[PDB]
UniProtKB/Swiss-Prot annotation:
Residues 3-92 form the TonB C-terminal domain. It is found in: Cell inner membrane. This is Protein TonB. The chain holds residues 194 to 285 of 285 of the full protein. It comes from the Bacteria. Interacts with outer membrane receptor proteins that carry out high-affinity binding and energy dependent uptake into the periplasmic space of specific substrates. It could act to transduce energy from the cytoplasmic membrane to specific energy-requiring processes in the outer membrane, resulting in the release into the periplasm of ligands bound by these outer membrane proteins. Belongs to the TonB family. The gene is tonB.
């Protein structure tokens, strides 16, 4: 299995914003977001590919990547990445 990626998925979720009515009306889901880390240590090029959930959450999941960017590992070259981002009314 992976390692460091599980822990940034946490730091991203800790910066990620969920709306004040969403738990009350039962809203959840998973957003697919494509991006890259540079070998220079910065994060760029964040774009949403797919979602099963609110387009208001899709706008928040993409920003959460930039918002946790100082926690991230360094690649050996600037390749590509394509990552799913999750929400829950469950504590997580």
């Amino acid at each position: 299995s992976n390692e460091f990626l599980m822990k940034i998925q946490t730091a991203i979720s800790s910066k990620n914003r969920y709306p004040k009515m969403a738990q009350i009306r039962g809203i959840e889901g998973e957003v697919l977001v494509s991006f890259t880390i540079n070998a220079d240590g910065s994060v760029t090029d964040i774009k949403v590919v797919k979602s099963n959930t609110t387009d208001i959450l899709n706008h928040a999941a993409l920003e959460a990547i930039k918002s946790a960017a100082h926690l991230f590992p360094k690649p050996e070259e600037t390749v590509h990445l394509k990552i799913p981002i999750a929400y829950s009314l469950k504590e997580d």
